[PDB]
Paper text:
While full-length DasR encompasses a homodimer in the asymmetric unit, DasR-EBD crystallised with only one monomer in the asymmetric unit and forms a homodimer with a crystallographically related neighbouring monomer. In ligand-free DasR-EBD, the cleft between helices αE1 and αE5 is devoid of any bound molecule, and, in contrast to effector-bound DasR-EBD, the N-terminal β-strand β* is not formed. Instead of β*, the corresponding segment forms a loop that is directed towards the C-terminal end of the EBD. The conformation of this segment resembles that observed in full-length NagR in complex with DNA. The effector-binding pocket extends across both monomers in ligand-free DasR-EBD and encompasses a total solvent-accessible volume of about 440 Å3 (220 Å3 per monomer). Whereas in the ligand-free structures two surface-located openings provide access to the binding pocket in each monomer, the binding pockets are completely shielded from the outside in the effector-bound structures. At the same time numerous segments of the EBDs, which most frequently comprise helix αE1 and adjacent segments, can often not be modelled in these structures. This also extends to the linker segment between DBD and EBD, which adopts different conformations in ligand-free DasR and DasR-EBD (see above).
Author numbering:
A (entry chain A), B (entry chain A): 91 to 252
């Protein structure tokens, strides 16, 4: 609670590595109840889904899948090409800024496709990150699910106790 | 950065589960340079090592191995039986209180012994937590290494961005 909401780029530089990305896929899907609840939209609502391959020192590091309300951000898909960053896009196009988020850390095995994209096998433990962010108006902005190579990644938290 | 320094008990209750423990082993070891640096003691220095089996809902959940300066806490081993908690012991016997800590999250496979103690196999992804704590006088107090069952555990962080 009350930790530092750091995006992918900073968490890599705060770890020595040089971050880069590659869009794998982008498109609209239909929200089931679970996703609808997380984005505060109605079930059946349209969701923009972005899938990116994250790299560091040139090699595959993570697959990052971001979900957002298409209804709220109907021109975001088109605008994303203009930008280096989803969050730049949200700030400049929609004046939306992340304020707070709940991050979940788990470990799991990769799917066959994931293993292929990350140059690992399906027996390597992977770090699974989920992130549920809200904006400065206290609305949910995104639900993010990422799979990190377990041999190459660690996540560091600085904790304090009052 | 600036997250909430939560001990094992709170992190379980903030997750629905009912926490219990069992001492597996306790004793002194000699610090190698790496450990000596973390506890701010001289290489060769004596370290109190505590190994505990953590349980929740009755079943095995984590193995938690804590290291402390024996020189600084020479009567801690003996005093630990009187107490429900290492941190109660440190507060009451030595007036030492955790103030800040660096926590590392990783995933790895269990050793054969670990797998046996946790009723899992060595193919299950495990969550590896390291914790390096300092006290209210800004000195290092502990270095902790824990292995959590990957099928049963998640770690939740609440992040903010100024």
């Amino acid at each position: 609670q009350a930790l530092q909401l750091t995006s992918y780029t900073e968490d890599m530089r705060a770890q020595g590595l040089e971050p880069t990305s590659q869009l794998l896929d982008i498109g609209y899907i239909t929200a089931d109840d679970r996703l609808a609840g997380l984005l505060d939209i109605t079930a059946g609502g349209r969701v923009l889904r972005i899938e990116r391959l994250r790299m560091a020192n040139g090699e595959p590091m993570a697959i990052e899948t971001t979900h957002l309300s298409a209804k709220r951000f109907p021109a975001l898909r088109r605008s994303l090409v203009k930008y280096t960053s989803l969050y730049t896009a949200l700030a400049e196009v929609y004046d939306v800024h992340l304020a707070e988020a709940e991050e979940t850390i788990e470990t799991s095995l990769a799917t066959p496709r994931e293993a292929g994209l990350l140059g690992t096998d399906v027996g390597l433990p992977m770090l699974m990150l989920s992130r549920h962010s809200q904006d400065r108006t206290g609305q949910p902005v995104e639900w993010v699910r990422s799979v990190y190579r377990g041999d190459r990644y660690k996540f560091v938290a600085r904790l304090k106790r009052p």
